[PDB]
């Protein structure tokens, strides 16, 4: 057997490899728990070793693939995120955008935070490449949600 340092990295690499495998599968939800439809997937991984942003982003990339208008799609997805209780949100769509000459467009609402480790703590993020007819769009989704609250609150009774 091998060192703890070797062990923990090997565990981390395996976690990434499974997560990326899951990402190729993904549709219904983000996750459904480790097991030491789903039956076949479990069988593949057992052979091998022997709300949140990503679902929303994936939904948006499917809509882009379906040929729905980008502005309408982004507005709907953004609205759903805020409606479902996001305290802020930013969605960026980069690339060709019904032209040869590429551009980007940001769609933010709410208290979306970029500064410091509170941003890292309370902003959940998802990146998606959409290959379409004329080439490629990059979607970058950021959702801000509590889990307590931002330190900017004075908290006087």
């Amino acid at each position: 057997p091998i060192s703890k340092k070797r062990k923990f990295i090997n565990d981390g690499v395996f976690q990434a490899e499974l997560n990326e495998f899951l990402a190729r599968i993904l549709a219904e939800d983000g996750y459904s728990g480790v097991e030491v439809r789903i039956r076949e997937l479990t069988s593949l991984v057992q052979k091998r070793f022997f709300l949140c942003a990503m679902a929303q982003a994936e939904s948006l990339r499917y809509k882009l693939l379906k040929g729905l208008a980008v502005r309408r799609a982004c507005y709907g997805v953004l609205r759903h995120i805020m409606e479902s209780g996001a305290k802020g949100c930013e969605v960026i769509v980069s690339g060709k955008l019904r032209a040869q000459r590429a551009k980007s467009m940001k769609f933010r609402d709410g208290y979306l935070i970029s500064t410091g480790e509170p941003s890292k703590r309370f902003v959940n993020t998802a990146t998606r490449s959409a290959q379409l007819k004329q080439g490629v769009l990059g979607i970058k989704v950021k959702i801000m949600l509590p889990t307590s609250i931002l330190p900017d609150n004075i908290s006087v009774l």
Binding site: P151, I154, S155, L157
Partner: peptide, 10 residues
């Protein structure tokens, strides 16, 4: 006692 301020510095 009065205010539930999150940092000592603050």
């Amino acid at each position: 006692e009065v205010a539930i301020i999150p940092s000592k510095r603050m």
